[PDB]
Design a protein around this ligand. Structure first.
Ligand code: NA
Ligand code: NA
Ligand code: NA
Ligand code: NA
Ligand code: NA
Lengths: 185, 281, 70, 70, 70, 70, 70
């Protein structure tokens, strides 16, 4: 399994095709459950994702954490690979063990293009993490002003309170992101 | 071997130290300029010692000339002192392996450590003053000393003498600072916290400097050297690390062109996530 | 899979409290907080790190990494 | 934005448990406790850090910082 | 029992948040969070550790380890 | 106010959960655990710390301290 | 009482999560979580630590320790 997941991570499309043609399993997990689709998705290798998916690799397949290829794509900012996963039936609102949606992850890492594509595919804008953290809280935290402005524009709840009562405005002040605080006024 | 450390003038004093260094150590290839280097003590069997006759406390006079320090050569510790008038070697309890032929050996109950000496002396090295006058007083205390147990004044004398002999031999910094007290103005040398720290880090410094290959700096615990002149201006002689090792087996790690004692970096890189640390009470 | 193996080229604490490292030319991030000091220590001391993960595309998450002094 | 890039000139733990660093002549503070020892290790070792924030005015906050070696 | 005594040959942060070290040719994992940086620092300095566990085969877990000055 | 400036002479964790450092001949304590590793690291690396407080009385608590390499 | 003052001869993370150091030939354990990295840093750098406790027999616990620079 290791060779097909190494090839996938390296984006080596002809090595993926040769291993597949020698009967390597398309769904082959590492330790921690990472499948070749997970590795391809995190590296943004579009061509590898399309050849894996057209060999019958499981689009929703979950790590031990409950991270799916659409989560790994989102974490990595890989817009085109997010779009092809969604167009092959990957669940937009898949939540990991700790309730994190792909919209939470995108928000967390500042990736405005995939925040916009996820929202347009029906991502739950106000989705609550286990400690009641919304995407707006993760994006006010980490100081991603552009994300915070794309949220708010799409009807994100500014009033929403985490498990400690703390708003998005609170968590910007506690991160000393004064421009985020201004934008949240 | 016997050497003299002559306190008559700064010249005689530095000359004396340099002569000792040249005989008992060899310069590091990479930390040597002219004949001023960081040198590694040449290997000698444990128990090997050299005697240091203290001279010149009264400038250029053959007075106050009955004190000899016995220095274990491999580590430069002062194993004890000899009253040459009474032919008596007062040896610290941790140096029973040092035998001086021809003298009466008085094995003391007191060990040689600074922890002990400072306690018995009721004198901390940090801030300790040494002047020509206090070395004479120190000499007189040692010559008056008799007994198998150090007294406060004898301990104070040894603290002062170890500093200006063994520690100055190790550290050109101490040689430089202390030697001012030998000038005609007779100022007072005050041992600084930095001087104390050097003495406390000698083994660590010794383990690291041999690895130096011109890095932009050297960091050993609290000690920092930013260039070779800082190294040379500070350290003269190091242990032969071939108390060099505290734990582990990796002398150094080069980080951002600075040679770090690996233990030091390990000691601030062994923290877990701060949030978890503080909340996990 | 072994996503990347090499020295950490840079690391970065992110606003979402995850931590990114660039290894062998690829960036990966982890949300595991205890990996922050572990990775920064590896970076400072020049350890070779092997980022391991189900998927290995640049910008992907990881929570398994091996550390070698060499 | 990249607010400041350079070595940490001083760091400072504040009474409100935030932590300030001065980089390239500008001071920035962070309320992310995790960054405290990471910034101190970077300061100790002369890492070049890049303070990143949407607001770069000296005295403002940050929660994103890149750590580079020489 | 004292399963392995020697330097850490490699360490590894695992997906399940446990941490593995290879000592005397055998891998051992621990779920003690506090041991992660302590083992990594031991590793970086070549500190000898003694892994103590009920079973000593490679793959065994441990919750006790001695950091030696050997 | 700058209460003391200098290297840390000793540090001490007390049974009452306070952490004392002696700087420039004066002792101050803090119960911020965040400061323990920071202060001890400053101590073992010889950083110059500046203890700051509105309260500069000996034996008083502090929670503001600047760290400088020197 | 000052039970022991000396360098840490070994440290050990115990199965009950307490942490033991051997100082002056006697073993002392502490359940104070904050002390683990500090004690290991002292061990790594050869700091003289002073174990203070109400009982000094080997096997006693402690919650107070001084970290000196000798
Ligand atoms: Na000479
Ligand atoms: Na010589
Ligand atoms: Na070492
Ligand atoms: Na991944
Ligand atoms: Na800012």
């Amino acid at each position: 399994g290791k060779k097909l997941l190494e090839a996938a991570r390296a984006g080596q499309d002809d090595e993926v095709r040769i291993l597949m043609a020698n009967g390597a399993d398309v769904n082959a997990c590492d330790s921690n459950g990472r499948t070749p689709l997970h590795l391809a998705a995190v590296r943004g290798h579009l061509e590898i994702v399309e050849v894996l998916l057209k060999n019958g690799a499981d689009v929703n397949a979950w790590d031990v954490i409950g991270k799916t290829p659409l989560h790994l794509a989102a974490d990595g900012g890989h817009l085109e690979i997010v779009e092809v996963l969604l167009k092959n039936g990957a669940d937009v609102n898949a939540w990991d063990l700790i309730g994190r949606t792909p919209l939470h992850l995108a928000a967390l890492d500042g990736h405005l293009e995939i925040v916009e594509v996820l929202l347009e595919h029906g991502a739950d804008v106000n989705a609550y993490d286990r400690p009641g953290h919304t995407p707006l809280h993760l994006a006010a935290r980490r100081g991603h002003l552009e994300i915070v402005e794309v949220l708010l524009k799409y009807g994100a709840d500014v009033n929403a309170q985490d498990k400690f009562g703390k708003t998005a405005f609170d968590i910007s002040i506690d991160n000393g992101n004064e421009d985020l605080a201004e934008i949240l006024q | 071997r016997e050497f003299t450390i002559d306190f008559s003038t700064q010249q005689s004093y530095v000359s004396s130290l340099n002569s000792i260094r040249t005989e008992i150590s060899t310069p590091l290839e990479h930390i040597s300029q002219g004949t001023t280097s960081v040198s590694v003590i040449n290997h000698t069997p444990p128990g090997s010692y050299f005697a240091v006759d203290i001279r010149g406390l009264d400038v250029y006079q053959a007075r106050f000339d009955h004190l000899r320090l016995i220095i274990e050569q491999n580590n430069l510790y002062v194993a004890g002192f000899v009253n040459t008038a009474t032919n008596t070697f007062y040896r610290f309890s941790d140096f029973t392996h040092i035998s001086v032929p021809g003298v009466t050996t008085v094995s003391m109950t007191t060990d040689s450590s600074y922890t002990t000496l400072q306690r018995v002396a009721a004198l901390e090295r940090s801030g300790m003053q040494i002047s020509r006058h206090s070395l004479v007083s120190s000499y007189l205390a040692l010559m008056e000393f008799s007994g198998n147990t150090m007294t406060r004044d004898a301990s104070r004398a040894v603290l002062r003498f170890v500093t200006v002999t063994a520690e100055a031999l190790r550290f050109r910094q101490i040689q430089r600072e202390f030697r001012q007290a030998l000038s005609e103005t007779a100022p007072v040398y005050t041992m600084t916290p930095g001087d104390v720290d050097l003495t406390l880090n000698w083994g660590r410094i010794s383990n690291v400097l041999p690895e130096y290959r011109g890095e932009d700096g050297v960091r050993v615990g609290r000690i920092s050297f930013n260039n070779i002149s800082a190294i040379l201006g500070t350290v003269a002689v190091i242990l032969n690390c071939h108390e060099c090792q505290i734990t582990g087996d990796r002398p150094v790690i080069k980080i951002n062109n600075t040679l770090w004692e690996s233990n030091t970096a390990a000691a601030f890189l062994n923290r877990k996530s701060q949030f978890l640390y503080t909340t996990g009470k | 899979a072994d996503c990347a193996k090499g020295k950490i080229e840079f690391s970065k604490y992110n606003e979402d409290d995850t931590f990114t490292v660039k290894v062998d030319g690829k960036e990966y991030w982890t949300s595991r907080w205890n990996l922050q000091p572990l990775l920064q220590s590896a970076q400072l001391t020049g350890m070779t790190v092997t980022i391991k993960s189900s998927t290995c595309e640049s910008g992907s998450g990881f929570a398994e990494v091996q550390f070698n002094n060499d």
